[PDB]
Amino acid sequence: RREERFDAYSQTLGGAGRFDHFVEWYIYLHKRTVSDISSSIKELEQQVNDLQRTVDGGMVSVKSLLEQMKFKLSEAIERNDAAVSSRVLTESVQKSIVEKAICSVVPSISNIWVEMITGSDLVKVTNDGHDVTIDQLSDGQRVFLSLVADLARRMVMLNPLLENPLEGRGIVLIDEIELHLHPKWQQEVILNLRSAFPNIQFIITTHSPIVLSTIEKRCI
């Protein structure tokens, strides 16, 4: 369900975002980038052709398998066509956009990627120069990462026709923007958000004089 375009509207106005949905979606994007679909179609097409030849050669026992493989091929083509039909950005590009957004906006994060460790897909981050899991991040880093990652995901999904999907339109409400942030980050947060999302109308609440020092009085 996380790959469906209108999943971008799923609990958008609930208050927390869905960072869990981001992680699932991001791992999904990684797996699809490592695995080309058309070669699988070509391979599946070749397998269907080989199985058809065996059935034509008198081996009626493999007819059930041929029908299954034809179904799989049709589904793969349909997905490819739906992907083609959606005019949606390539999974590789989507991944890159989001990664750049996160690293640009979140100061302690320089890199984010998916590792296959043991038999499970794990998101890793370079945080303050050291590689760590998301669960190892500080609360302030995680909370801010969650906000940006969620927002970027939704923008990528809702703006497939833009060269930069983060230049899409919208209205974003943020309560207590300084939540968990040290003064140093409070001095950069508004500038970074507005630079990453230039056409969003931001309506925000703050208790921070440090944040206010970066904003014009007309906005207050």
Binding site: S108, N127, H130, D131, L137, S138, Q141, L181, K184
Partner: protein, 208 residues
């Protein structure tokens, strides 16, 4: 024994308690007075004769820390730094240690909390284990109560043991003395960022 008697008469709480447990009046009253005695200061505030506080904390290969020592104030300590400097890690380490006192005040031989083998060992530590060492003070009669919580990383074949017996020994004094004659008991609490939550009056906990 005569050795315990000498120490106990010198004001040692653990010796007094050992003598109480072996004979089970004099020794009981020593233990109870050690816990309950105090006075009202010039400001009208009650002050226990024997204070209880964390003196010192040491972290070895714990999360971001390779080896770190903190000396704490008896009254107020404030830790400051940028995001990611390990301020919350320090509080978590202390809270896990305190869990051993709480468990043993509730139940003889009760189990406290543990360091995580998934997250708490420093990622690039060559020795694949972590130690959280604390020392507590409880008056001049018990100047040092050392506790160590330890954990080895998940793959590792050697396993590193915790040392919690001193915590259990002190908590046993509180629990046993209280059962015979009521005493005041210490409060241990952690308030982390999880304290921010929605309120629902509708939900009632029916457990205890």
């Amino acid at each position: 024994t005569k050795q315990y008697e000498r120490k106990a008469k010198g004001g040692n709480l653990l010796s007094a308690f050992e003598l109480y447990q072996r004979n089970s009046g004099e020794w009981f009253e020593m233990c109870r007075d050690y816990i309950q005695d105090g006075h009202v200061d010039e400001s009208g505030i009650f002050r226990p004769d024997n204070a209880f506080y964390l003196r010192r904390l040491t972290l070895k290969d714990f999360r971001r820390f390779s080896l770190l020592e903190i000396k704490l104030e008896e009254d107020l300590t404030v830790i400051i730094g940028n995001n990611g400097k390990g301020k919350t890690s320090i509080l978590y380490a202390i809270a896990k240690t305190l869990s051993w006192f709480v468990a043993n005040i509730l139940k003889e031989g009760g189990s406290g909390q543990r360091l995580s083998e998934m997250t708490d060992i420093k990622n690039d530590a060559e020795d694949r284990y972590s130690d959280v060492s604390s020392t507590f003070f409880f008056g001049k009669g018990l100047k040092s109560v050392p506790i160590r919580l330890s954990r080895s990383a998940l793959g590792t074949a050697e396993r590193r043991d915790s040392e919690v017996k001193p915590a259990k020994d002190l908590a046993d004094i509180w629990r046993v003395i209280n059962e015979v004659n009521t005493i005041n008991l210490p409060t241990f609490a952690l308030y982390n960022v999880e304290r921010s939550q929605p309120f629902n009056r509708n939900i009632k906990d029916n457990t205890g």
